[PDB]
Ligand SMILES: O=C(O)CN(CC(=O)N[C@@H](Cc1cnc[nH]1)C(=O)O)Cc1ccccc1
C-alpha cells in the first residue's frame with residue numbers, strides 16, 4: 001500500500017511495435033500521471049498540463065494566464081536565479097517551452113537522460129513557489145507585447161480573433177488571449193492594479209493539483225519514476241477547483257445567418273463557412289466529426305472540391321470539425337477563391353449544401369466507418385517513435401480527456417458505429433445556422449467596422465432570407481459521387497529479412513552517368529515503411545528567372561492534376577513531396593512500401609507525358625503572382641534572411657525579377673520548356689527502409705526507363721553538374737544592406753560573421769555557438785528585452801559556415817547591432833572566467849545533442865540526405881566530429897574568437913542585413929568601424945571573390 005498514491009491504472013494499451021514501458025497512476029492530490037520507461041533513450045523529457053487557459057482570464061486583465069506562463073520560467077523560491085532553469089537545461093543538452101490555449105497551459109522540457117531528476121526538480125518548482133519578481137515582470141511584459149505585435153499583421157491571427165469578436169461579447173470565447181503591454185502594464189496601472197499580486201492570486205487559485213496532468217519519460221524503471229513523481233509532486237496542494245465548462249455556444253441565433261466582408265493584409269481570396277455544433281468530444285469512440293469531415297473534405301474523384309475546382313471557382317478546400325471548448329465545437333468548410341469563384345460565392349455555397357444533401361440522401365455507411373477504423377488501426381500499430389518532448393507534451397494534454405489505459409489509443413482507435421450521431425451532426429449542418437466570411441482585397445474602403453485588437457477592417461451583414469431559402473431547397477446533385485473503396489490500403493506489412501551484405505550506412509550501389517543511387521535497408525526501426533528520395537539535376541531549372549518560373553508552374557500544374565488520384569494514397573499512409581530547386585527538381589515518396597512503386601510509376605509517367613490544361617494554367621499562374629506579391633507582407637526577419645541569401649549566393653533570382661519575368665510565360669513556351677527540361681538529366685537518389693537492394697535497383701531503373709521511354713532523356717555531363725559558391729568577404733571588412741518592410745512597423749536584422757566546413761572549423765563554430773546559446777537569449781531578450789525573436793547560432797550554406805544573430809525588435813538596428821557587439825565582449829569575458837569543468841559541461845552537452853540517435857526512419861533519412869545534397873557524404877560525421885570536439889580546450893576557442901569574431905579581429909568577416917520598420921545599466925558597447933553600404937547586390941557580388949567547394953568523403 002501507498003498513501004501518496006490514490007490509484008494505479010491497469011495495463012496501458014500500446015502498439016505491439018512499441019517497446020517502451022508505461023504506467024498510469026493518479027496521485028492522492030488528483031494529479032493524473034503517465035510514466036514512460038525507455039532505457040535506450042538519449043534525452044529524457046517531462047511535461048505538465050494545467051486544464052486552465054486564456055478563457056479563464058479576468059475580464060479586466062487580458063492574457064494573464066499567458067503572462068503567467070511566461071513568468072514561471074523566471075525564478076522560484078527554491079531556485080531564485082532568473083535563468084537557473086534555462087541555464088541548467090542548456091548546460092545539460094536540454095530545451096524547454098510552453099504554450100497557452102483557451103482551456104490549457106502546457107509546459108514541457110527535454111534534457112540529457114542523466115540529469116532528468118535535476119531538471120525535473122527545477123521544473124516542479126514552477127507549480128509550488130514561483131517568485132514573480134517585479135523587475136522580471138516589468139521586463140517580460142515587453143516580450144509578451146512583442147509576441148503579440150509579431151502576430152498583429154498575420155492574417156490567420158486577425159481572423160482567429162475576429163471570430164471571437166463577432167460572437168457573444170459576454171461569452172469568454174470573445175476574450176483576447178495573447179495580451180500586450182497595454183493590457184498587462186498600462187491599463188492595470190491606470191486602475192491601481194498590482195499585477196504581481198493578481199498573478200499570485202491566479203496561480204494560487206487556479207493551479208490546483210486536481211486540474212493537472214504529468215508525463216515523465218526516462219531510462220529509469222517504472223518504479224523509480226513512480227517514487228520520483230510521488231516525491232516531487234505530492235506537495236502540490238488540492239484546492240478542488242471545479243473544471244470550467246462552457247455549455248452555451250458563443251454563437252447564438254442573431255450571430256447566425258451572418259455575412260462578413262473582410263480586408264486582408266496579403267493579396268488572398270478566401271471563403272469561410274462555419275456551423276455551430278455541440279461538444280462531440282464525448283463521442284470519441286465513434287467520432288461522427290471525422291466521418292463527415294472525411295466525406296465533405298474528400299478530394300478524390302466525384303468530390304465537392306473536385307466539382308468546385310472543375311468550375312474553376314476554388315483551388316483548395318478544407319472541411320470538418322474544429323474544436324472550440326468544453327461545451328461547444330464548430331464544423332467548418334473553407335475554400336480558397338479564384339477571380340471567378342469570388343463572383344460566384346453564393347453558387348459555391350449552394351453546391352456545398354447540395355453535397356451535404358446528397359450525404360443526407362445516402363445516409364451513414366458502415367463500410368466507410370470500417371475503412372476509417374482499419375486505417376486508424378494500421379496508423380496506430382505502425383506509428384513512428386515520437387520525440388520525447390512533443391510526446392510527453394501531447395500525452396499530458398490528452399490525459400484530461402481520456403482514461404489512463406486508453407490515453408495512447410484514444411485518438412486513433414474507433415470502436416462504435418453510430419449512424420444516429422452521424423445523422424444528428426449532419427442535421428446540424430443547415431443554412432438556418434450558417435456563418436459566411438469572405439476575405440478579399442476587393443472590400444478595401446467599403447468596410448464600416450474595425451476589430452479592436454488587430455485593427456481588422458470588416459463589414460457585417462445579414463444574409464437575405466431569400467438566399468437562405470435557395471440554400472434550403474438545395475437539390476441533391478449528379479456532379480457528385482461518394483468516394484469508393486480506397487485502393488491504396490496496404491495489405492503487405494511483411495518486414496523483409498536483413499541481407500547478408502547490409503551496411504550500417506547508405507551504400508553507393510549505382511554510379512552511371514544517368515543516375516547515382518544510394519541505398520540502405522532499415523536495420524533499426526523495422527516498420528513496413530520506406531523513404532524514396534530523388535534529386536533531378538538540370539541546368540535549365542534555374543538558368544534564368546523565366547525558366548525558374550516555368551519550373552515552378554510546371555510542377556504546380558503536375559501536382560494539381562495528380563491531386564485527385566494521389567489523395568487516396570495520402571489517406572492510405574502514402575504521400576509524395578514534389579518541388580523545384582536551384583539545381584533542378586526534387587521528389588520524395590514516403591510511407592508504407594506496399595503500393596509505393598505504383599504511386600511512383602504514376603508520378604514519373606505523368607511527369608514525362610504531361611499535357612497542360614489552360615484553365616489550370618492561368619489560374620495557378622495568377623495564384624503564383626499573388627504569392628510573389630505577398631512575400632511583401634512577410635516578417636522583417638524573414639526579409640532579412642531572404643536578402644542575406646541573395647547577397648551570399650553566387651546565383652539567385654529576386655522575387656521582383658521572378659515577378660517581372662512571369663508575364664512573359666505563355667502556354668506554348670511552357671509546353672516547349674518541359675521537354676527540354678527533361679531532355680538531359682542527372683538523378684541522385686537515396687532509397688531507405690523496408691526494401692532490398694534488388695528492389696531499390698528495380699525502382700531506380702524503373703524511373704530511368706520511364707523517363708527515357710516517354711521523354712527521351714539522356715545523361716548529363718559531369719562538368720555540367722554546376723554548384724553555386726558563397727561570396728567571400730575580405731578580412732576586417734564590414735558590409736551593410738538596408739531595406740524597408742512597408743507592412744509591419746517592426747524592424748528585423750541579421751548579423752553574419754563568416755571559413756569552409758572542415759571538421760575543426762565546424763566544431764569550433766558549433767562549440768562557441770553552444771557556449772553563447774543561452775547567454776544570448778538571457779541577455780538580449782530576458783534582460784534587455786530587445787524583441788520576442790532573438791536567435792543565434794551557426795549558418796551553413798554552400799559548404800561555407802559562419803555565426804549568425806537574427807533579431808526582430810521595435811528598436812533600430814543601428815543600436816541593436818551595438819547591443820550585439822557589447823554582448824560579444826561579455827562572452828569574451830565570461831569564457832575567460834568560466835571553469836574548465838563548466839567548459840567540459842558545454843562540450844558534453846553539445847556532444848550529446850550531436851550523438852542523439854534518430855527515433856524514426858524519416859529522421860535518419862534526413863541526416864543521410866543532408867550528407868548527400870551537401871555532396872559531402874560524411875555519414876560518420878557525428879562520431880568523427882564529436883571525437884574531435886572533446887579534444888578542444890578553452891583557448892582554442894579564445895583564439896578562435898580573437899582571430900575570427902572579435903571586433904578588432906584580423907579575420908573578421910561581417911555582413912549585416914537591416915530591414916527597417918514601416919515608419920522609421922547595460923554593458924559597454926565597442927566603437928564600430930564605418931560600414932560599407934551595399935546599394936547594388938550584383939555589383940557587390942562581382943566585386944568579390946568566390947569560395948571553393950568542399951571535397952566529398
Ligand atoms: O489540421 C487539423 O488536424 C485540424 N483540422 C482537421 C481537419 O479538418 N482535417 C481534414 C483535412 C482535410 C484536407 N482536405 C480535406 N480535409 C480531414 O478530415 O482530413 C481542422 C482545422 C481546425 C482549425 C484550423 C484549420 C483546420
Ligand SMILES: [Zn+2]
Pocket residue numbers: 066070144147
Ligand atoms: Zn508566449
